Amino acid sequence: SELAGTIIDGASLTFEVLDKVLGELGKVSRKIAVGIDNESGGTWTALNAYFRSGTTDVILPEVVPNTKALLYSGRKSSGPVATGAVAAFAYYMSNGNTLGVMFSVPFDYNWYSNWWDVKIYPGKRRADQGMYEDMYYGNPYRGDNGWYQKNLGYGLRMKGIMTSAGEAKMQIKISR
């Protein structure tokens, strides 16, 4: 039972599916369910991922169809006691770029903030701690409730939603 519900059309795969799946598939005490919607224009082929706290089995599917959404799972490092949910992954676009998604959920939110960003490298690029922390400081977003995001280069726009509720979900959809 991994925190991967369904990957059906984004019209059905929404924030609500992420809130519910945490209770349905709920691996350990602190669980992470995110919902990215691929509408950038092309099938997303998995290349590589980098998990530091959200340590899981599988998150990068072989190929993802466009105009649709997907789910990610992750559970803590030690299991019962550890950091909330921290990981970064990347997706190969058929247009000739690499969508590098970044997500960080600490545990001492009382002091340390939880910045989150998304960029698209101009070619086949990995996701590692250097590239994570190098772009982390670039978009100081803690997940403002409602719908909050940044504009992307190359003529693109990604849309996202998170909240400071502590154990909240993460949903990001590309909207041209």
UniProtKB/Swiss-Prot annotation:
Outcome of swapping residue 16 to Q: Shows larger hemolytic activity in human red blood cells, but no change in capacity to form pore
Any Gene Ontology CC annotation: other organism cell membrane
Region (Plays an important role in the hemolytic activity): 2-11
UniProt-listed InterPro entries: Actinoporin_PFT, Anemon_actinoporin-like, Cytolysin/lectin
Descriptive protein name: DELTA-stichotoxin-She4a
Comment field on protein domains: Composed of a long N-terminal alpha-helix and a core region rich in beta-sheet structures. Before the pore formation, the alpha-helix binds the lipid membrane, partitions into the lipid-water interface and stabilizes the monomeric molecule on the membrane. Finally, it traverses the bilayer, thus forming the transmembrane pore.
Alphabetized UniProt keyword annotations: Cytolysis, Ion transport, Membrane, Nematocyst, Secreted, Target cell membrane, Target membrane, Toxin, Transmembrane, Transport
Any one Gene Ontology molecular-function term assigned to this protein's record: toxin activity
Residues reported to bind phosphocholine: 53, 86, 104, 106, 132, 136-137
Site (Interacts with the lipid membrane): residue numbering on this chain: 142
Primary location: secreted
Region: N-terminal region, residue numbers: 10-29
Motif segment (Cell attachment site): 142-144
